[PDB]
Amino acid sequence: VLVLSQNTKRESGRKVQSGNINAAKTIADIIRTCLGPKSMMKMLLDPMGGIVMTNDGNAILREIQVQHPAAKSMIEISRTQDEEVGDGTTSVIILAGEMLSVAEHFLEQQMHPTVVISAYRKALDDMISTLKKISIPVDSNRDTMLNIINSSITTKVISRWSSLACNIALDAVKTVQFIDIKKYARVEKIPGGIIEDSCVLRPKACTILLRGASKEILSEVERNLQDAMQVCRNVLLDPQLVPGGGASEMAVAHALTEKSKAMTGVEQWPYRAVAQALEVIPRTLIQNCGASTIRLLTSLRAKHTQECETWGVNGETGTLVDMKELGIWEPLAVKLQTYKTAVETAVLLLRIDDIVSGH
Amino acid sequence: QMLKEGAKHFSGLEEAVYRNIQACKELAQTTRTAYGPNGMNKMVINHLEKLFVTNDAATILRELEVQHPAAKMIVMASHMQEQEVGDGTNFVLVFAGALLELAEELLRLGLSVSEVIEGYEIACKKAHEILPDLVCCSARDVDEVSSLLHTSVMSKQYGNEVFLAKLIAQACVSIFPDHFNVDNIRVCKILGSGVHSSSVLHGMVFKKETEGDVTSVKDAKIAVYSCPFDGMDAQVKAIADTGANVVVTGGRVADMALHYANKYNIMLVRLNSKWDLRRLCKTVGATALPRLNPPVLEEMGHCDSVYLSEVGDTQVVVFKHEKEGAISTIVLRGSTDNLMDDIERAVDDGVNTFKVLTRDKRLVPGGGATEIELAKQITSYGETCPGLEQYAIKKFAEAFEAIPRALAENSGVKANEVISKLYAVHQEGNKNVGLDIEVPAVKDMLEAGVLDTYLGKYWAIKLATNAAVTVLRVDQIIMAK
Amino acid sequence: VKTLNPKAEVARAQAALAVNISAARGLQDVLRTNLGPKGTMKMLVSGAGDIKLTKDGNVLLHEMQIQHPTASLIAKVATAQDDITGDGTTSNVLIIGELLKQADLYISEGLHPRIITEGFEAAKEKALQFLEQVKVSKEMDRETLIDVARTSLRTKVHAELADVLTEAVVDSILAIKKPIDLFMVEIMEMKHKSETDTSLIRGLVLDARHPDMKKRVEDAYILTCNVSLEYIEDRVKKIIELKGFVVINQKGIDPFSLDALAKEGIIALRRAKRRNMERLTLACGGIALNSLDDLNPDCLGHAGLVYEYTLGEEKFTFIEKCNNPRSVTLLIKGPNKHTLTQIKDAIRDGLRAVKNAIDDGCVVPGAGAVEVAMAEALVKYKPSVKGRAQLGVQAFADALLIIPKVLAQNSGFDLQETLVKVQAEHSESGQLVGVDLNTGEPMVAAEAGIWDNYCVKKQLLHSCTVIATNILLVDEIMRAG
Amino acid sequence: VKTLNPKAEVARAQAALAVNISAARGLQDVLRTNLGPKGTMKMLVSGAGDIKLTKDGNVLLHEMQIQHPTASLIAKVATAQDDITGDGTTSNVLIIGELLKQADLYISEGLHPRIITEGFEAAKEKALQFLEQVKVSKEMDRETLIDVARTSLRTKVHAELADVLTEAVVDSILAIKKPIDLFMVEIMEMKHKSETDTSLIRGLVLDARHPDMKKRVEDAYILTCNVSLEYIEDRVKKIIELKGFVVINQKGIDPFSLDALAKEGIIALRRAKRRNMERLTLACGGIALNSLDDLNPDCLGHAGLVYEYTLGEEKFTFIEKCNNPRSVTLLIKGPNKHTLTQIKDAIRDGLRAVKNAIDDGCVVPGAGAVEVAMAEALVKYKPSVKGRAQLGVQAFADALLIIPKVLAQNSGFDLQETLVKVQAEHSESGQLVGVDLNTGEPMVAAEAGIWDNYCVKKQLLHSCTVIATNILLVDEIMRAG
Lengths: 359, 481, 481, 481
Hints:
4 chains; B: six-stranded mixed beta sheet; C: 481 residues; alpha+beta; four-stranded antiparallel beta sheet; three-stranded mixed beta sheet; 17 helices; chaperone; T-complex protein 1 subunit gamma; T-complex protein 1 subunit theta
């Protein structure tokens, strides 16, 4: 009979949603822990005795040899997200995985994909309007830009001299800003000394001259600086910023859920499913703190719906606090793309009901 | 060594929860099919190779071989519910499972079992407060009587005669309901002709044994006996002096005691069950005369009609037309034993339902209507009650969504679609809005007629709840083999 | 070597200690699931399919077929904790278990068992002496008694109606104290109705055989009779002449004798349990003569009001208003029989709780409030003893902290986290700091009413240390002959 | 659904954590028996007749081909303790190992990994700061240097003649200090004779070419050069014109040039090691140009006595007596060449400590004195921070107590017993109380002369806690086969 070449696996219908969804969900729960300042860096040991210690989800997915195509598309999700800005690489992955985890459930209730996906794509459009309907518009302006660039240098090996790197990124971006071009900032890294002996070299395109005691440290100062420049590239395209600590996710969630009862129908559930999915961010967040995720979630949505959106998860205090007051802000672009790249992936991923391979 | 001896199956925490919940689900779903006019009966055959074709969940569980601890708790819920009002026997089952299902999901997430119970227990008291407010009080009144009896006759094999079984039970429970008692109703399953031949006899029917005796006695002076008529002349002669033209012996009667009772023109009946004797003493006013020497004329009950009818081709004495007949007899008729079994099973239920009226007029629009309302209310209630309990309360209500879910289930209607629609139309059409299986679409149960007893629902929630809660606490139990 | 007989297990070296520790630890964790107000009762089913569902630890460890020689010992500990004191039976099992845990930690480190024993023992004495400094002095105060009896009823089934039962307990205990005696409070449980009808009679409650015997005798003179009244009228003549209006017989009464007794207006009952006869002679002051001819007008107990009222369709004989108001009866009205089973155990403990409360004006803040205290005390007592002994004390203190931990455990809250709060608040407020699960935070146990009897805590450390340590010595059992 | 490659063992929950901690604790067990002045060396036999017998932790962890993905990290930690400092390498290993084990205790109890992470981090702040409050300020005196230098040599093979070596060190470091620099001590090992022949030569020591050239020069003007002297006379004429009596060539010399230089009475050697060429330019202060016509009196070294003694049938050219030997040579004569390797490594560390000693007149009471202190300081520091951290800090304090315990372990005295005595006396005398194994009782380190450098200790806790915690966060790794 051999309808198709011998040994060519072909998952069909339900046999596809299962192997595809889970595989992606599972890979999303792997780097999940590597979220937040409490990240649990895994020590990836390739099949040769290698020792890869890292927190970044991308770098991890590029070390773990995957065979199932579904999990491979994920490594591609972190490849696109990590190239744009850098951080949040795990965010887009965790979300894409959850969406499939909450979707499969509906599949159990026998909710045909057509309906689901339809709600997913539409819900995606809701988050975008939401993100903009609550973003905090902050000023160019050297002062502001500094803060933005600083928060993009406070987690890497360059955080050591972030202040210096900031003034360097701020200048490199504010000068090559006509929409700013990320190809007019030449980075001349030179091994030797401390990252403190750096100085921007001026011009329709400067020549930043970095310095690095080592070879690995110098390339790191180049990447982080480039990312510090990226956020600055966003304040030129997306001068909007929303409170982090999960504050955002919670808002969009509480909003989407409310919209669910307004839309009703069969798609009334998916809407909530997507909203509840956004809750994973603040959930897993507080989890990295060893605090009660559930309990927190309760009090979270509590003071959140009562007193504006200025409240978020305070990992250092293991409790809910006014992010705005603490001075915790995240570029709307950062969040903007996240929800997008996520939903999108999950969507078309759910359209995959078969994969012709070889074994 | 071994923590516990041998042959002791144990389960702790979640490990136990999963098993208990699972076993209850399959058991709750098994009978779930026996709900509504789409009730799919089952055939259980015990050791004695006996076939039981019943739609009543209780009858099913009390005939199924259950050895699972938690699972046995479900047999109790259906047992009590069947002893309370009868109707809703399956209601408790399914619901009980759904609860455990929603609860288990809460634990796997990290929620404390304690809170679970509290949330569920608190919502159990809230619902018992919502039902009495939403309920639709109805008017006794033969017009309203037939309405409730007409909604309790459907969903069974005798639905073809829901009009006859309605009037038959409407007449009986309306001749001696002082404070009505379901024990003053004697149903007889006589084979022959369709159920459209069922009659209502004002009294108690049985089977005589003598021919030459008076087959149809007028104002009879019944004398209930229990002592055998074996040796026989002085015994039967002492019965003719009192004026007893109708002898209802409890045990056997001697052939010489029959010939004498056959000569005195006294209709004698031997082999009378102990219950038939008691029912004959509270219907005609006869006294349970032990020996055959103490009977007199003041121990004889009066029965205006005691004839021998051969309906269906089987002789039967009909002691009807008495002074204060407190016990009537429902003469059922069936073409097959199968149909006769189902019919009777449902007749009793209606007898209990009517007994609920005499002690509770209130009634609710069944068919899932009330369930959805409670779900709606309870859910909102949860949002009004802060704390982790808000989750447990809302989850409890989500369980009520399993009732209408099963309704559209035994009909082949996508629950996901019918449910969402039901709620929407229910949040606008109020309580009355329900689900009409005969025509897959939302419909006013109050108008459709489908009305259940308030008290019927009440107990259900409580019994099922408390029960489920118990099975969840005992999360560690080995044995003692 | 052949000092043993074929098939003789032998524990050797650390192996014994290991198996023993884990053993006692395992069973200790299994019973730890039913501790606290959020505890969970267990359903033990022996061979005959029996189903023992209780919350008390002792009973459980008495039904579970334990194969662990160590656990078996842990069963003897819970026993000596239920026979001497009663409540908290669980608390003990956990202490000894957790205690061994701390020790082993040390043993595996290199510390010799002996030195460890001295460490714990050194802390024990001090501990018991600390309970003598932290005991709350009150009195036969009715208020505190109500609090204790109430707190005792809690953490159980009747926790729904603690207020009512508690009150009855205080009264019954106040009328039986001479030196309190629980054998003066007859606990009679009856089904039908709710458990909110429970009343407190001041006499006897038997559960007129003949329909002609008075249903209410005023100054009813009881003529206790043990012998049977069968093979008759001459025996009835001897009673009427002895002026016996209420003859409570222990054996059956001949049907003909009841007619002669009722004809005289004599109220005679038959088949009375021997235990009820002795309670009728110690309350009404009557003499129980064997033969019917040994009775006399001087062996008749004086009763004030002997009425037969229905306690749920069942007519009970109330013989209250006895000449001696020191014999009270605690009637228990409740739903099912199984429910009354547990409840009856609650009162048994409630009476014992109040009993010791009056016999001993001690009332320490339970809910671990004492545990944490003693713990911190020893922690500051270990530096004064130093040596490996310092460790022992410390470990004993760390083992005492298991109670509060388990509390935060069965509640769902974070064990460790809560422990820090309670400890930090205990060293700031005093000995009145406890773990209130209902509030999810440490509160003043002496302010919520949560109090425990000194005897408990005191006896606890005693039974624990002794046995526990002994289990560290027995490093080999060997089953031979 | 093969989301992972075949044979890809994966560890997620507690598994990874537990498995990781164990692997680190195990290695810590293999390097724990070589700590303290009584520790025992180890012989690493790399399957190939190779026998590496040393005591240094690093070296050992560098020869053992470990497979533990975790131990490798441990081997990395010890590496960061030998580079940033020197000795103590072992100590650091035992700290990280034992510490992780302390955490596992907390984790298995419910404590969140990251939460415990901050604990050690917050306790580290205190631990380091305390070192600042215990650092005894010493001087660059000779005594303090001889006492510390000796202690360094001890715990090793040369412990037999530590006194002598210590002398050679104090002189080599005192002569190179003007801002010290260990890279000024030319460690040159030579077999033959006993280890009691090791001397400190204030100059280079090579291993006259032509038999016609002078062999013993009084005050030779070192005219070091690189380029070869072969194609010759014009090259020899320029040397005598520059007043170069002892020409040290890096390359060989032409046969016709060795007779010309031997004629002028010039002492020239050929084929000298490059390292020696640099050690002669910094010691005798001479310049070693390239060509020959370039050399001049400006590049002449001022040696005091360059003779040739064959100490061991091997002609050696000793160019001693340098004006200002900024390049001192510490000659080392040992019985076996293997003994030299160890002695050399011992000095390299011994010298290091001295450098630190003179680079800062600071030092801490060794022998566990510091640990017992920090531990006590942290214990009183835990009640302040409070919260789940309190445990973290306390655990960190207990983990610090591993040093003293192990010491008694490698000595032969009771672990716990000694710990008590040391702790008691410590909480009395002060930071001066340590564990003196050489006496088998708690003594004053500062008194016995036992002191440890500041840098050493400080670096120990840092590299430990830091790396240690990271491993704890790694809950997964994902592999393949």
